Amino acid sequence: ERQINTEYAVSLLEQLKLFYEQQLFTDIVLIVEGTEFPCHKMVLATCSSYFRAMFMSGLSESKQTHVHLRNVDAATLQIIITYAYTGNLAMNDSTVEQLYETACFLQVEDVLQRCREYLIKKINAENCVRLLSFADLFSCEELKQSAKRMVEHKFTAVYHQDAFMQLSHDLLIDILSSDNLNVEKEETVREAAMLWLEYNTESRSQYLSSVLSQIRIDALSEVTQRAWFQGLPPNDKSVVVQGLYKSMPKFFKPRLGMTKEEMMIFIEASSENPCSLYSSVCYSPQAEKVYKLCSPPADLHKVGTVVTPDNDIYIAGGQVPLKNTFRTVNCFYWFDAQQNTWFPKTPMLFVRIKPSLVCCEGYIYAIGGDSVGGELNRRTVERYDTEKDEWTMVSPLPCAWQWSAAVVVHDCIYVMTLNLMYCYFPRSDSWVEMAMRQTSRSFASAAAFGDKIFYIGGLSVTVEIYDVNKNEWKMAANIPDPCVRAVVISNSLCVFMRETHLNERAKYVTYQYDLELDRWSLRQHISERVLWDLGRDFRCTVGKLYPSCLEESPWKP
Amino acid sequence: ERQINTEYAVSLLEQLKLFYEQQLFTDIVLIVEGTEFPCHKMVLATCSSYFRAMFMSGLSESKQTHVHLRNVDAATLQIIITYAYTGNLAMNDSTVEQLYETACFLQVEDVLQRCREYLIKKINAENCVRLLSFADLFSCEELKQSAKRMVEHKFTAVYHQDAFMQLSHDLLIDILSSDNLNVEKEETVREAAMLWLEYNTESRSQYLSSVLSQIRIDALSEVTQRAWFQGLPPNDKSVVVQGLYKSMPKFFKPRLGMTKEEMMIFIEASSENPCSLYSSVCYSPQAEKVYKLCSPPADLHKVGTVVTPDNDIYIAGGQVPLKNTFRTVNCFYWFDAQQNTWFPKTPMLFVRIKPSLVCCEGYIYAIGGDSVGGELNRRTVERYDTEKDEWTMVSPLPCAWQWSAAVVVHDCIYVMTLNLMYCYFPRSDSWVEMAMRQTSRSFASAAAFGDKIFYIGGLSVTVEIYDVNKNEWKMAANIPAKRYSDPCVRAVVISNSLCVFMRETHLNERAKYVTYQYDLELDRWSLRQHISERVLWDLGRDFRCTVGKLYPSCLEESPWKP
């Protein structure tokens, strides 16, 4: 059907807006705690699913011109009316709750979906349990699930949120009884359930018993009984009887968060499947297996990795082929530790090629990486805010460097280039000159192990160790065209190198390096029966993953 | 301004349409000769400028839900309402008059402008005086003016319309007193004014004075004066007195249509300013002057020309540079004989390169011209309708030819190629095989002079004359041209006499323009006139020539130093 809108629908909406702001042809007025809102019935019927029944049903409101609508905020109803009259919402970050409250009040489906998306995108660090209780009160399965997983991930690291105390039982039961608790130990959930019953007892003793049972035998074999003898109300006999029941039944099973194996995440591998360009796989140091990961964009490559102290994976920048009949994109992504997917985040402001992301003081710092190339000050850096979810410009780099590396030592930013090093102080937002290397090597990376930076490789086997407390560069030894990948494994400095000769196959083997010995002892030789060739542009980083969520990479020995 | 429409305005309009078709939330109903139209007041207020006052002014009609609106058609009001719930007008070609009438009654500006544009684009041949009286009834400056000029151009060739008889005086005065009458003689307007007052003699003797005076002294001859005298109602004395007054006063001046000089229209000339590539100029055979014309697209080139028997200029096809930071366009245009501009028309269906347009039986026939080709067949042709304003597909060419020429002789289509020729029968829509030339020459054109086709040039000076009644090709002579040169021949009819316009070019020599007079039985090109270089400059190589009548006052002379 022909529904042309060229200069017609916009003109109609502009005429309606003009009639609204001039108070013309209005036949209904909303009374909101003394505030008047003259409007029309047609717009309220086409926008809200409640006003259509308010103006159709032949009751009292039908003839009532002065309808007194209560339990609604003035500003929220005003923004809903102006959204109905112009189509633009222009929502902030503070009044989203009351907006959704009154949007669900009038079943206004479009603004409901808009606010639902805005809330599902903005579960950053703190409003998680709050918006989870919000979605529990206003049954919203979409928001409910994302918030559920978000809490399963972060709540099991703070378990002290002020909002977490005020939760309904069913929601707490769903949270605690789930097998998605990202906890490496079983006593933290026990004490967390405990403190949730240390603020409210006596009248709430039923909930106490329920959560106690939920904790299961794994955490029921603790001080739970003694703490209860201490806080139980007097003259309670059957309560001890029902508490003694919880010890032998109800399927004691292992949890999921304990499977936080410290593994080796790789990217841009040799797609086991021929013409496929690249793939992201993983390696297990202890399990001696090779797991795979899903490509974040599935077509874009040349990305940079970073791992926060909370074991989080991020991906920024990269280039994607234009697919006309490689363009650079500043998109951003984050790896899910359980869903084996990639949820995007706030993109960058500059399209970078192979950005070097560094985490420090809870902030992500992307140093260099072909920001735009044609900058007036070619040396610049853009940092990320993991809490506010925004990018903040900081003091630019002193000199323009290419194929550089950057690490973080002692809560400070350290970027390494051919021969120079600069310490970005995040507190004073300044760059202090550091020691210069006597050797000029590029195309190499550095590792931040302890309080020493180990710049390995370059063009080789150059081992130049730097210390922060000493501020000096020294050599240790030569590792016995190697592709070096220095990294931290089990609080012990190790390396992952691959050698390649003429008419010979590649071999993967990791060595154990000692500080005072200056020697790379043979730790483990990666057999080719489990791991195949990776390539040249592959990257390495240390991080904890889950074996059950991920899938093994099928490949013939 | 802060306002969107992406899936929010379209959704709102769809919800309004759903409420309308389901008869929901309706509070006003229109009664149109018994037919009911339940609708809303908001849409009628935002669409029409009359319904806003019908529903705003505190009145009995504002309160009445059963309003009885009269003097409006049911179908027109229905289409206006659906255009007020969908925006899709979907107007036909028949109900435009009543639709515009109802729109002017309801003061709906958007549909008014839409119908005004649709009417100003569709003044083809016949509804001219009708829609002119229509625009005189509903004051419409735009329609009024385009229709005025359209009548000044075509009315002065038929002067026998039935709607012309039914015209208001002021409109007839404006038409007749204007100096835009495209008439080569002054008696046609006189007899037209006569028959306008011959269907209403006696009854309308009041206008039989003003219209009589409008024709002026040029046609107020003693003969017609005395005729009207002996013809009037009896017992009329002062009427003869006021008629005798109209003979000596009121500024006898020459008209404009008489300046229909048979001139020589040209396209793609050597532009003077280096910022422009080509230009379209003209040449006067009798006045010995060089006039210019405005470029139809002002950037597109490689066009084809055609001249109807009614002296009309058309332009089809062509290529325009893409201006990225030559693409082919199937656009169409028409040259105004007085405004010195180009009004576009219905474009073609295929983007052609240098199309050959031929006029026959009132239809324009575009034969070949790279309509777009990439197969073994490809041979195709698209004809134009000057009356219905549309393109009609006909029997396609039998063989695929390039750099071909086509003319019209004895109301038949004749296209010429390297060596073959086919005659397309417009009555049966088929191609019949004709005679074959013994010489294989291309890159040449032909002229339709009388009952003989004169294929001149080709690669030269090949003069191959063909006759339709005889169906044979023969040679006549060789045009006298200087040796060591490459002549650019142009054959065209002028003053009912076959002539040629050729230019010779040598090495390290300048170009010379000269037209010769060719005789049929003599087989010789007598020196008719040598175009002096002091008035005409170089043209180029890809220039075209065609015969047509133009106006010197409307056009402008081309300034160039001798």
PDB file of C-alpha atoms in Angstrom, chain B residues 220-389:
ATOM      1  CA  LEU B 220     -10.936  46.303 -39.994  1.00  0.00           C
ATOM      2  CA  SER B 221     -11.203  46.761 -43.804  1.00  0.00           C
ATOM      3  CA  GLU B 222     -14.187  48.677 -45.292  1.00  0.00           C
ATOM      4  CA  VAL B 223     -15.455  45.316 -46.700  1.00  0.00           C
ATOM      5  CA  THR B 224     -15.880  43.515 -43.323  1.00  0.00           C
ATOM      6  CA  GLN B 225     -17.079  46.778 -41.699  1.00  0.00           C
ATOM      7  CA  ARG B 226     -19.996  47.096 -44.215  1.00  0.00           C
ATOM      8  CA  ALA B 227     -20.700  43.325 -43.954  1.00  0.00           C
ATOM      9  CA  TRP B 228     -21.205  43.595 -40.147  1.00  0.00           C
ATOM     10  CA  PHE B 229     -23.289  46.761 -40.823  1.00  0.00           C
ATOM     11  CA  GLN B 230     -25.819  45.117 -43.218  1.00  0.00           C
ATOM     12  CA  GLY B 231     -25.847  42.065 -40.866  1.00  0.00           C
ATOM     13  CA  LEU B 232     -26.772  43.697 -37.471  1.00  0.00           C
ATOM     14  CA  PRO B 233     -30.259  43.737 -35.623  1.00  0.00           C
ATOM     15  CA  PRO B 234     -32.733  46.146 -37.238  1.00  0.00           C
ATOM     16  CA  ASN B 235     -33.243  49.701 -35.973  1.00  0.00           C
ATOM     17  CA  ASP B 236     -29.576  50.020 -34.955  1.00  0.00           C
ATOM     18  CA  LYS B 237     -28.068  53.429 -35.753  1.00  0.00           C
ATOM     19  CA  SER B 238     -25.512  54.295 -33.060  1.00  0.00           C
ATOM     20  CA  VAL B 239     -23.909  50.869 -33.529  1.00  0.00           C
ATOM     21  CA  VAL B 240     -22.915  51.759 -37.097  1.00  0.00           C
ATOM     22  CA  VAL B 241     -21.595  55.066 -35.740  1.00  0.00           C
ATOM     23  CA  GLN B 242     -19.371  53.377 -33.155  1.00  0.00           C
ATOM     24  CA  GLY B 243     -18.257  50.852 -35.769  1.00  0.00           C
ATOM     25  CA  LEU B 244     -17.221  53.619 -38.164  1.00  0.00           C
ATOM     26  CA  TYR B 245     -15.011  55.071 -35.395  1.00  0.00           C
ATOM     27  CA  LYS B 246     -12.819  51.910 -35.431  1.00  0.00           C
ATOM     28  CA  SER B 247     -10.682  52.503 -38.592  1.00  0.00           C
ATOM     29  CA  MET B 248      -8.110  55.314 -37.949  1.00  0.00           C
ATOM     30  CA  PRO B 249      -7.191  55.311 -34.127  1.00  0.00           C
ATOM     31  CA  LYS B 250      -5.661  52.757 -31.713  1.00  0.00           C
ATOM     32  CA  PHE B 251      -2.054  52.250 -32.783  1.00  0.00           C
ATOM     33  CA  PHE B 252      -1.919  49.960 -35.822  1.00  0.00           C
ATOM     34  CA  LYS B 253       1.289  47.989 -35.228  1.00  0.00           C
ATOM     35  CA  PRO B 254       2.815  44.844 -36.747  1.00  0.00           C
ATOM     36  CA  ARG B 255       2.278  41.505 -35.040  1.00  0.00           C
ATOM     37  CA  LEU B 256       4.816  38.866 -33.950  1.00  0.00           C
ATOM     38  CA  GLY B 257       3.723  35.639 -35.648  1.00  0.00           C
ATOM     39  CA  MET B 258       4.600  37.055 -39.071  1.00  0.00           C
ATOM     40  CA  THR B 259       8.299  36.845 -38.101  1.00  0.00           C
ATOM     41  CA  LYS B 260       8.406  33.124 -38.896  1.00  0.00           C
ATOM     42  CA  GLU B 261      11.681  33.216 -40.819  1.00  0.00           C
ATOM     43  CA  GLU B 262      12.721  29.774 -42.137  1.00  0.00           C
ATOM     44  CA  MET B 263      16.151  29.607 -40.413  1.00  0.00           C
ATOM     45  CA  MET B 264      18.896  26.968 -39.803  1.00  0.00           C
ATOM     46  CA  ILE B 265      18.988  25.502 -36.234  1.00  0.00           C
ATOM     47  CA  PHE B 266      22.395  24.011 -35.208  1.00  0.00           C
ATOM     48  CA  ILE B 267      23.602  22.050 -32.145  1.00  0.00           C
ATOM     49  CA  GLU B 268      27.009  21.326 -30.587  1.00  0.00           C
ATOM     50  CA  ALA B 269      28.945  24.282 -31.966  1.00  0.00           C
ATOM     51  CA  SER B 270      32.411  25.467 -30.964  1.00  0.00           C
ATOM     52  CA  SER B 271      31.772  27.252 -27.671  1.00  0.00           C
ATOM     53  CA  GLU B 272      33.288  30.711 -27.267  1.00  0.00           C
ATOM     54  CA  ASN B 273      34.052  30.673 -23.542  1.00  0.00           C
ATOM     55  CA  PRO B 274      36.458  27.803 -22.716  1.00  0.00           C
ATOM     56  CA  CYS B 275      34.371  26.987 -19.622  1.00  0.00           C
ATOM     57  CA  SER B 276      31.646  25.552 -21.891  1.00  0.00           C
ATOM     58  CA  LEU B 277      32.142  22.670 -24.318  1.00  0.00           C
ATOM     59  CA  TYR B 278      29.396  22.967 -26.954  1.00  0.00           C
ATOM     60  CA  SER B 279      26.623  25.386 -27.877  1.00  0.00           C
ATOM     61  CA  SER B 280      23.476  25.525 -30.008  1.00  0.00           C
ATOM     62  CA  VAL B 281      23.262  28.388 -32.508  1.00  0.00           C
ATOM     63  CA  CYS B 282      21.239  29.266 -35.603  1.00  0.00           C
ATOM     64  CA  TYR B 283      21.783  30.805 -39.032  1.00  0.00           C
ATOM     65  CA  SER B 284      19.516  33.049 -41.096  1.00  0.00           C
ATOM     66  CA  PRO B 285      19.515  32.406 -44.867  1.00  0.00           C
ATOM     67  CA  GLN B 286      17.802  35.689 -45.784  1.00  0.00           C
ATOM     68  CA  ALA B 287      18.892  37.952 -42.917  1.00  0.00           C
ATOM     69  CA  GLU B 288      22.481  36.630 -43.216  1.00  0.00           C
ATOM     70  CA  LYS B 289      22.875  36.621 -39.425  1.00  0.00           C
ATOM     71  CA  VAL B 290      23.869  34.046 -36.805  1.00  0.00           C
ATOM     72  CA  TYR B 291      21.551  33.681 -33.803  1.00  0.00           C
ATOM     73  CA  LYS B 292      22.140  31.578 -30.697  1.00  0.00           C
ATOM     74  CA  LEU B 293      19.986  29.255 -28.603  1.00  0.00           C
ATOM     75  CA  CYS B 294      20.088  28.116 -24.995  1.00  0.00           C
ATOM     76  CA  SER B 295      21.437  24.639 -24.291  1.00  0.00           C
ATOM     77  CA  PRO B 296      18.489  22.397 -23.306  1.00  0.00           C
ATOM     78  CA  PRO B 297      20.254  20.578 -20.419  1.00  0.00           C
ATOM     79  CA  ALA B 298      23.257  22.982 -20.249  1.00  0.00           C
ATOM     80  CA  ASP B 299      25.597  20.026 -19.583  1.00  0.00           C
ATOM     81  CA  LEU B 300      24.384  17.006 -21.619  1.00  0.00           C
ATOM     82  CA  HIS B 301      25.471  16.516 -25.233  1.00  0.00           C
ATOM     83  CA  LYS B 302      25.125  14.079 -28.168  1.00  0.00           C
ATOM     84  CA  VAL B 303      21.446  14.813 -28.809  1.00  0.00           C
ATOM     85  CA  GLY B 304      19.237  14.289 -31.846  1.00  0.00           C
ATOM     86  CA  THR B 305      16.928  16.815 -33.486  1.00  0.00           C
ATOM     87  CA  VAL B 306      13.602  16.621 -35.307  1.00  0.00           C
ATOM     88  CA  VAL B 307      11.190  19.169 -36.779  1.00  0.00           C
ATOM     89  CA  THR B 308       7.482  18.433 -37.101  1.00  0.00           C
ATOM     90  CA  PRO B 309       5.474  19.947 -39.980  1.00  0.00           C
ATOM     91  CA  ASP B 310       4.125  22.389 -37.365  1.00  0.00           C
ATOM     92  CA  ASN B 311       7.666  23.775 -36.824  1.00  0.00           C
ATOM     93  CA  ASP B 312       8.407  22.256 -33.416  1.00  0.00           C
ATOM     94  CA  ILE B 313      11.853  21.414 -32.024  1.00  0.00           C
ATOM     95  CA  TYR B 314      12.490  18.348 -29.861  1.00  0.00           C
ATOM     96  CA  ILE B 315      15.531  16.839 -28.146  1.00  0.00           C
ATOM     97  CA  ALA B 316      15.846  13.223 -26.996  1.00  0.00           C
ATOM     98  CA  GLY B 317      18.576  11.034 -25.542  1.00  0.00           C
ATOM     99  CA  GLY B 318      22.112  12.258 -25.023  1.00  0.00           C
ATOM    100  CA  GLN B 319      25.022  11.757 -22.652  1.00  0.00           C
ATOM    101  CA  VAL B 320      26.130  13.898 -19.708  1.00  0.00           C
ATOM    102  CA  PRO B 321      29.450  13.678 -17.812  1.00  0.00           C
ATOM    103  CA  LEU B 322      29.006  12.006 -14.437  1.00  0.00           C
ATOM    104  CA  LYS B 323      30.736  14.958 -12.700  1.00  0.00           C
ATOM    105  CA  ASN B 324      32.225  12.523 -10.176  1.00  0.00           C
ATOM    106  CA  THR B 325      33.867  14.690  -7.491  1.00  0.00           C
ATOM    107  CA  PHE B 326      29.616  10.550 -19.742  1.00  0.00           C
ATOM    108  CA  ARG B 327      26.465   8.876 -18.423  1.00  0.00           C
ATOM    109  CA  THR B 328      23.544   8.384 -20.800  1.00  0.00           C
ATOM    110  CA  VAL B 329      20.133   9.845 -19.920  1.00  0.00           C
ATOM    111  CA  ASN B 330      16.831   9.107 -21.681  1.00  0.00           C
ATOM    112  CA  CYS B 331      15.421  12.568 -20.923  1.00  0.00           C
ATOM    113  CA  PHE B 332      13.271  14.516 -23.381  1.00  0.00           C
ATOM    114  CA  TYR B 333      12.829  18.237 -24.007  1.00  0.00           C
ATOM    115  CA  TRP B 334      10.990  20.724 -26.211  1.00  0.00           C
ATOM    116  CA  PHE B 335      12.066  24.181 -27.367  1.00  0.00           C
ATOM    117  CA  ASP B 336       9.816  27.162 -26.678  1.00  0.00           C
ATOM    118  CA  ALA B 337       9.445  29.422 -29.712  1.00  0.00           C
ATOM    119  CA  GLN B 338       8.920  32.541 -27.579  1.00  0.00           C
ATOM    120  CA  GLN B 339      10.375  32.020 -24.091  1.00  0.00           C
ATOM    121  CA  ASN B 340      13.762  30.795 -25.420  1.00  0.00           C
ATOM    122  CA  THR B 341      13.792  27.914 -22.935  1.00  0.00           C
ATOM    123  CA  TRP B 342      13.284  24.139 -22.859  1.00  0.00           C
ATOM    124  CA  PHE B 343      10.329  22.477 -21.138  1.00  0.00           C
ATOM    125  CA  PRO B 344      10.913  18.749 -20.483  1.00  0.00           C
ATOM    126  CA  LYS B 345       8.421  16.064 -21.454  1.00  0.00           C
ATOM    127  CA  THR B 346       7.873  12.358 -20.820  1.00  0.00           C
ATOM    128  CA  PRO B 347      11.339  10.731 -20.919  1.00  0.00           C
ATOM    129  CA  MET B 348      12.150   7.629 -22.928  1.00  0.00           C
ATOM    130  CA  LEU B 349      12.395   4.068 -21.621  1.00  0.00           C
ATOM    131  CA  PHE B 350      15.926   3.390 -22.927  1.00  0.00           C
ATOM    132  CA  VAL B 351      19.005   5.587 -22.564  1.00  0.00           C
ATOM    133  CA  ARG B 352      19.939   6.271 -26.196  1.00  0.00           C
ATOM    134  CA  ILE B 353      23.127   7.761 -27.641  1.00  0.00           C
ATOM    135  CA  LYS B 354      22.445  10.129 -30.561  1.00  0.00           C
ATOM    136  CA  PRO B 355      18.872   9.026 -31.355  1.00  0.00           C
ATOM    137  CA  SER B 356      17.396   9.605 -34.807  1.00  0.00           C
ATOM    138  CA  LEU B 357      13.923  11.081 -34.312  1.00  0.00           C
ATOM    139  CA  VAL B 358      11.524  11.078 -37.276  1.00  0.00           C
ATOM    140  CA  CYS B 359       8.087  12.708 -37.427  1.00  0.00           C
ATOM    141  CA  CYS B 360       5.288  11.055 -39.402  1.00  0.00           C
ATOM    142  CA  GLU B 361       1.478  11.128 -39.142  1.00  0.00           C
ATOM    143  CA  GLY B 362       1.763  13.326 -36.049  1.00  0.00           C
ATOM    144  CA  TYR B 363       3.959  10.787 -34.229  1.00  0.00           C
ATOM    145  CA  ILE B 364       7.659  11.031 -33.378  1.00  0.00           C
ATOM    146  CA  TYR B 365       9.675   7.938 -34.338  1.00  0.00           C
ATOM    147  CA  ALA B 366      13.077   7.423 -32.695  1.00  0.00           C
ATOM    148  CA  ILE B 367      14.963   4.870 -34.809  1.00  0.00           C
ATOM    149  CA  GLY B 368      18.035   3.231 -33.264  1.00  0.00           C
ATOM    150  CA  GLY B 369      20.704   5.195 -31.454  1.00  0.00           C
ATOM    151  CA  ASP B 370      22.257   2.788 -28.929  1.00  0.00           C
ATOM    152  CA  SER B 371      18.937   2.397 -27.007  1.00  0.00           C
ATOM    153  CA  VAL B 372      21.363   0.168 -24.962  1.00  0.00           C
ATOM    154  CA  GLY B 373      22.864  -2.899 -26.709  1.00  0.00           C
ATOM    155  CA  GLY B 374      24.579  -6.162 -25.685  1.00  0.00           C
ATOM    156  CA  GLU B 375      23.127  -9.123 -27.659  1.00  0.00           C
ATOM    157  CA  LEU B 376      22.911 -10.656 -31.184  1.00  0.00           C
ATOM    158  CA  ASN B 377      19.456  -9.047 -31.765  1.00  0.00           C
ATOM    159  CA  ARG B 378      19.383  -5.615 -29.980  1.00  0.00           C
ATOM    160  CA  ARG B 379      17.719  -4.031 -33.104  1.00  0.00           C
ATOM    161  CA  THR B 380      14.822  -2.047 -31.468  1.00  0.00           C
ATOM    162  CA  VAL B 381      12.801   1.208 -31.997  1.00  0.00           C
ATOM    163  CA  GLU B 382      10.598   3.354 -29.668  1.00  0.00           C
ATOM    164  CA  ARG B 383       7.926   5.738 -31.093  1.00  0.00           C
ATOM    165  CA  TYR B 384       6.452   8.792 -29.325  1.00  0.00           C
ATOM    166  CA  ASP B 385       2.845  10.006 -29.145  1.00  0.00           C
ATOM    167  CA  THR B 386       2.540  13.783 -29.478  1.00  0.00           C
ATOM    168  CA  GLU B 387      -1.148  13.661 -28.459  1.00  0.00           C
ATOM    169  CA  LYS B 388      -1.322  11.080 -25.655  1.00  0.00           C
ATOM    170  CA  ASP B 389       2.186  11.994 -24.384  1.00  0.00           C
TER     171      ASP B 389
END
